[PDB]
Write a protein that binds this DNA or RNA. Sequence first.
DNA 1: GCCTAGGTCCCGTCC
DNA 2: GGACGGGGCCTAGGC
Lengths: 239, 239
Amino acid sequence: SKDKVTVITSPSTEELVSLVNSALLEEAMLTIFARCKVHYDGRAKSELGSGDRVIIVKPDGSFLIHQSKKREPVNWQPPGSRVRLELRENPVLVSIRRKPRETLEVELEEVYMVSVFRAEDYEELALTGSEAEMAELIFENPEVIEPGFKPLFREKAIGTGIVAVLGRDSDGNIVVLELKRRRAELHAVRQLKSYVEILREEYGDKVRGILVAPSLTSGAKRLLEKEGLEFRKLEPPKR
Amino acid sequence: SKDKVTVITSPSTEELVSLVNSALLEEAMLTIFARCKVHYDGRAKSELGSGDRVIIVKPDGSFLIHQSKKREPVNWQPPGSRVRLELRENPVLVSIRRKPRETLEVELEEVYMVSVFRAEDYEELALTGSEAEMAELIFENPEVIEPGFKPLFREKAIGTGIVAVLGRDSDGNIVVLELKRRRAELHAVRQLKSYVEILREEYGDKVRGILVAPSLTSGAKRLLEKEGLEFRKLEPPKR
DNA sequence: GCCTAGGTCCCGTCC
DNA sequence: GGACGGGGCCTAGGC
Ligand SMILES: [Mg+2]
Ligand SMILES: [Mg+2]
């Protein structure tokens, strides 16, 4: 019975059903290559005409449909969904999501391959260069901002919003940082500017916003300078 | 070049190479089930220990590595990545991208299955329920906003930023619309307020922002009201 | 559950 | 090319 992989090319309906249902029940990865048509209804609504795609169903209920291009799936369902195979004029893979109600229907016109991959993964990703690690860097070593900077809070909620880092300078002013792990764009400045306005209410005009990022878009620089805010160039560190 | 699909389970290196080669050469989809390690250096840095994953290489250079959970590849590479297979003491898939420089390395420790799928797809997705369709609604039916509302511009760049819908109202003010296809968050109110400020600079005190969306989060309504902006409930249309 | 914000975001678009 | 903002965003962290 059980090897990591079970493949059948150009399978019978009996074989299809056999494997598909076995995948769902054994909680393993179903992969399929097929000519299909897709029907999605949910937050938005979509239609995809006949063509060959890859289809993946994870044991956690995530459902992917990949065309020959891009990175993103053309259609999907996120983890937690429930899938059932339905026999009709053609077999149909059907994933239902509750909360929000969403339906994905993959009509299988021709199945070129069905497979069951019983995959064992105990390892999880280890990633460095996050903005969280920027914050770790700053709290360990505040001078990367400027002399006498005193970081105090992280992900601190002010009244409306949550600021990346809140602290004080050598003059005793409230200081806001918004951090970005890549070049900072207009929404970055809008974030900072938003937090500073709100802080100016309690603490007055003392308050300095600083954008901390490796670089800055032209439009970000403009809006920064128009609003009298500051920029510290900082690269996110790699372990 | 051959049948739609080729599959080899527990391939030899010669078989593995043969297939991978054919895939890249034929603009097919490469699919691998394998025990592997993944190393990524680029915009960020990551490491992933030995484990079973589904690996996909699309002919447009897209590179997906999927574990048994979530919707998201654990590691990946967007279109325009040269992939190739180097033989170290294990075969390694190597995907490189420039601008920015990024290296993805998948060390195939045990390949359980390799497959070449010459997928044929001429169909593009049709989706409805989007921000753009809200916009269209508003232009062909301005009264969904308010009576005597005249829409003028769509995706119109003002000095700093790009407004969703720009227009005028019956009493002669300039109106800014920010649209969201789903419940609106702080991010959207910051966008709106930002735009309104900038347009106040030319046209002074007569400017209205209106956030148009099916609903607001708590902070969104909080901040909306505080800065004296307006809301119209609207649901994206599904055609 | 809702809210808030990041992401190796991807991706389209228009300058 | 850089830049700006949507997405069925997803996903993680508070609460
Ligand atoms: Mg932040
Ligand atoms: Mg907008």
